[model samples]
Target chain A: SFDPFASTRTFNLAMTDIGEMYLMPPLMEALAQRAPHIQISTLRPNAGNLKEDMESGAVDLALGLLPELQTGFFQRRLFRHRYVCMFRKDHPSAKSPMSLKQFSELEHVGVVALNTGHGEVDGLLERAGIKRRMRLVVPHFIAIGPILHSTDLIATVPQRFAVRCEVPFGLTTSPHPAKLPDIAINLFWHAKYNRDPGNMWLRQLFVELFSEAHH
Target chain B: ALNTLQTALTTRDSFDPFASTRTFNLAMTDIGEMYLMPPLMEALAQRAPHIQISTLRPNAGNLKEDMESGAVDLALGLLPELQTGFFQRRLFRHRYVCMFRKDHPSAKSPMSLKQFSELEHVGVVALNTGHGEVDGLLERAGIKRRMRLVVPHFIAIGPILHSTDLIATVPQRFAVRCEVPFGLTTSPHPAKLPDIAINLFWHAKYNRDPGNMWLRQLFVELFSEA
Candidate 1:
């Protein structure tokens, strides 16, 4: 039988982006229903340790471009994400989309994904010969909301992240004025776990989730 | 000596990992007990293949009840005596001293005992036991401590959160855990606040039985160094 779980088993899975959406509840519910003896657990690395954690094999699976995961790992693209220019609703530029020139002129609060490695958006800025005036480089996206509401600082973030924090932190979003590269997030895992039954089951579970989500 | 009997039991339950024929269930307090336990457990399991053991952590509320009712066969910590049916045996000893934030307006590397006593507010845990050691020290110094925030256990995080304000007199280990903070500091006091002794206790009936005898020897062998 292909199922390694004909007996007792223990499995651990690690992922960073699940906190941004309702991604974990359904996976946990499925594990509860099907595998009783298998003790499944999850480890979440704080922003300070994300890159090292992905590289160290401290986590059995990493689902996010952490530079440390470059070796002995496998990757599958989850989605292509678009970038957005975010500001508070009452700010002077709130009513309009921002141009790359405008983005460079503003006091930008960059959501430096300290835990998740750098994305391709920064490269887009360099290609346009524009450099943003970075006012703050915080560890998490949640901090962006506060920086946007209380100050004149602007941020360039993934459209989904901007949309997620818009209403709660009193912020609004528009398309980046200059054309930039799309943000790509991938489902990553250690190469050694490719054929392990528990790892295989979880990857299949994630694939089903993304398929349903896109539909 | 304890292994001689544990081996007798381990042989019977060799195949059953969890259901080894003999087991010692202990109830313990989260104290300076890292001084013992790890090495003793390693030695006994190495000597006795059939014996199994488990431990229950006891907070102030259920500790004595766990002991008198046989929910635990042994209890370890700085136990004070009560009029009860269980027996007691001394294991080892240690002590504590007062500590304050290094940055406090009035604190020095070693503040005078009287100047230390004049502080209007202090912080203490609301443990039913152990506070008497603090009270006795203050009385001997002809002063009284006004405990301010007796929130919970050791104040490692709490001291850092309120770095300049709270002064705590605590077990040396609790102070050692907070040593890295620049705002935190401690000093070994000259006062004989009280020398502390920790011991183990079990119900009297099990005292002489071969299995219990073996356990008692194992307990001493494990903790005598601590």
Candidate 2:
């Protein structure tokens, strides 16, 4: 156990908007039980700009479907995720074995995150000639579950996130009407802290909790 | 360059809703945004259609310094520390309640102080000044609970509470607003918690400025419990 309870240090993680909705809760619970004094902050991407930020230790690790950090960072796999459509269980237009035609016709909830680099799903859809009939535009995914639960609006989000809200929020999910590539959610870190014991502990804790890779 | 100086010279010292165009910078919490933004904007549209509004986080900028510099016109919510020459008026007396889904295990039963501590909790960080005070109040009374998650803003709390067993201690206004929409309900937190007096605050420097007075009075007339 790497114990440092002086706790003056704030451990900063760089992540997208949805990263906190899923990652922080479990990590925080772990931190609270094992290391209650440690402070944690989630930052939007920054320098060398981002490359430099990690080099300067402004950010410790980045969690999400970050495709941009493949160059200077070491990445460890946590899980593979795919996009799916979600809506209220009682939604009138949401049908199983859904077609792209039906999916295109329904009122859509748009979740656009600027810092997260994944805002192009709708852009890609438009390119494919599948236009979204926009009903509500939200900046974060945190609001999607409740909004979907209350309205006829449907959203295309990561499968795990859809399932996370499935039973609790009384929602249903369908496979994407259009084929979207599966994304490997990974833990990206700087080479500077590769062998640091504190970093190692956090990395291992996350893997033990979430990694679906073969041993 | 000539046009810039000409506009500056023609700038009116007095405010007229139809004639003047300005963007008022306001600071508030996410809870304040949910509770106040709709009506506030509704009122602004009819009175000052040419103007705009910008909302800043209280913890983002130096709240006091920004207000002093006139960069921030007013701040809303439980800003008790915006003191020393800062003038304030009570918006309303608010309460804190334990919010959870209607079907939570502890839903039907009235929770005790110990029972409130046994469940998993969702807490907020860096939103309000007195939020930590509420946590400290519980800790002093030995009511520490497991913080399953701590979110940076109040935007996510309603959905999370609806979907999980996590209980949150939030402003009563937020709970009431989300109750019907999210299939959630509220109960009194078992502790004898103090009621919060939400306030609107402004710096003395803009005490009599026309725009400031109109903005301040509009909020007071619309929101003030009096």
Candidate 3:
């Protein structure tokens, strides 16, 4: 007797902000469509020992940005991202377009939870030899909402994610008025699953579903 | 500058359909301590220049349908299943790893492929289901396990703390967040795996609009490793 639902199979995914968005949907859809009973899970990490976890078989796969890990794991590029400025509406500065100098002066909610200061935009700032005085720093991206709506502090974050969340925070998107860097994001998995029938189905579906579906 | 002008040229609505402030019952994923969503939401306000943005995480089963039905506007996570015909992708590449407490008795030596394979019990994280990376690796290695522990992601590291014998696999970045004087350690499993990448995604409806376009372009430029 062949029983498909012997044990609940779950996939642990690690992705950067962009990969989380672009790739997650299609994968979930595929699972629901083909293997309805199998469970799917997501793991998001700003940083950590993902390599050991994945290698040790603790997580099925990791799908976000990793800078210092070197292993035999396989990864696929989901897309790339860029940085921009975010502010509240009706602010005095909103009345006038912002320049790089004026932009930096505003108290900003910066995303500093990551251990490495390797953000594409942050690196650009460091390379340019400019630093914005941090007015407040939050541990997670979601925490900045209340502060952005009630205060004049501005933030520079991934532009797409900013736009997606703007209305909820009463915030507005603005040009950085400075040269910014780009973020390259990808999907990761153990090579052993490369040829697995189920994973192979999902992986190809993920690339196809997400590659063409823009925005 | 160019993006601002583009928005003015394409202004259509005051409130974006995708923001979290528009509703309260919505679900969102706070993958780690990534505190960028608020700032990112604030940036969205500039595009609509009027709406509010809230953060969200996808439930395991409904995330895909939610996006397809326009129940949710956008998602931020890894694009592991891109080959499927369900969703669209934004930024596509990044990094990931596995880590453990530095002072754990087993963490002293650099973990090799063989040692990684010998673990009798290990922690596994699966956001929506039970079978995770470790399960797949064990199957491939032909390693049989009589005692296997499977748990949801939020509590993945909990067992590892008080019990040194337990080893759970997690992202490399989690190691950096450790604040204790413990011997946290990380190494690639001797078994070769995939390099992880982060991604952004949305329904096809939102794919090419000015606001969505601006956000997508910016995400790629800011987060892509290249």
Candidate 4:
């Protein structure tokens, strides 16, 4: 019953800054090929405003790892990812995997989105009664590329991003020594549009393209 | 005598900035673009309508090279990383203030260093730059603060502060503009911090160019107010 190519429709995709950086290029490419009549508007995900936007029918779908969701929103886990430690090529720990103590002792850079400080990993460290020293904090993943290249700070980023930015930033990755939990990247939509034909089709496209099990 | 007269006439003609339309390329940091340029641009629009302005991000490492190559006409920032052989002028001294939501728990009282440390913070760090002056001062004072969020520009300060309980230490001028609109409250920073000295830098080659001189004068008239 879904005809994605029947008419021209502009769909708004609300995403985090990191999601835009890593996923937008390939996602746009596939959309162009499969759904040529569909247009996309990428919007920044504002913390307190997302629900209002969704309720007002301003946003079609959003993609990111959400810690919590308001009522009237439906979420489906699309993929899972773990963290990796990224450091400069000449950093002391670049040649080998770091130990838990070394990892805690080193100066770290944290990526905080919407006033949250890598909460999943922070909670993990807290449970282990180990606190790492985070000297620098940035809001977006793109800021990490330049800061790591110039300083001795260590950044704990998603494995998918670590691999993509390793060569571009002149950086290397070391496996996280502490047992960290993987986060679920999910697609969120207002419950009101759950049955919309175009929305369902686009959501399926993203799941097929980015699911961890697919790769 | 005739050759000398000809050279003088050419120099005089070249020095007239109002004789032709000119575009000035300015290199500035993120905070500078957000908090400083809006009013300055408005002033320019009225005073020098023929002059166009283009802005570029300032690269602290290669600013000298960029200026020498004529790629950057002028730059605005703290000049600690700048090298020698450039002309410099003080624009203004930047003071600091703490910003938080109007209904935050600590809003009714002055913030102490302990509360400042315990409450999570939001920071504005220019990319590829050194640590901020406040962070350095806190380290020297032997107090550690937890910055939960760090953004690249001051433009995010209002949104992040309005939506979350996190607080930020920003330039007093920027706080003054956004505090009312965002329903944010401002308090003096608890710790003693040296005022940031902001300066304008230009290569020696353009120090005397009529266009560059006009631009410099405009910056002084508009931004030098306390």
Q: How would you encode candidate 4's per-residue C-alpha lDDT over B1-226 as one tens digit per residue?
A: 3443443355532534344456667777656654555566446545654454556567534777888766778888865655665888888877887889899866534788788888767665544533255666677898776654444445445545765667888877667656765578888888787677778988766666677878888888888753
* Whole-model lDDT values for every prediction: 0.55, 0.72, 0.51, 0.68
Model 1 TM-score, all chains together: 0.40
Better of 1 and 3 by DockQ: 3
Each model's TM-score, in the order given? 0.40, 0.60, 0.45, 0.50
DockQ of 3: 0.05
Question: Model 1, B159-208: lDDT tens per residue?
Answer: 32233344566667445434432246766653557766777877654555
Error of 4 at B15 (Å): 7.0
Candidate 1 chain B, poorest ten consecutive residues by summed lDDT:
B152-161
lDDT of 2 by residue, B86-167 (tens): 8888888668888988898665446777778788787776434655567777778788877655555665566677666778
Whole-model lDDT, model 2: 0.72
Of 1 and 2, which scores higher on DockQ? 2
| Runs in model 3 lying further than 4 Å from the true structure | A1-8, A16-35, A45-48, A69-71, A95-97, A116-123, A212-215, B1-226
What's the CA error at residue B156 for candidate 4, in Å? 1.6
Quote the true-contact fraction of every model: 0.00, 0.01, 0.07, 0.00
Rank the models by lDDT, top first.
Answer: 2, 4, 1, 3
Query: Quick one: best TM-score, which candidate?
Result: 2
- Residues B117-159, model 3: lDDT tens digits: 5553444445442224556766786855323333344223322
lDDT of 4 at A102: 84
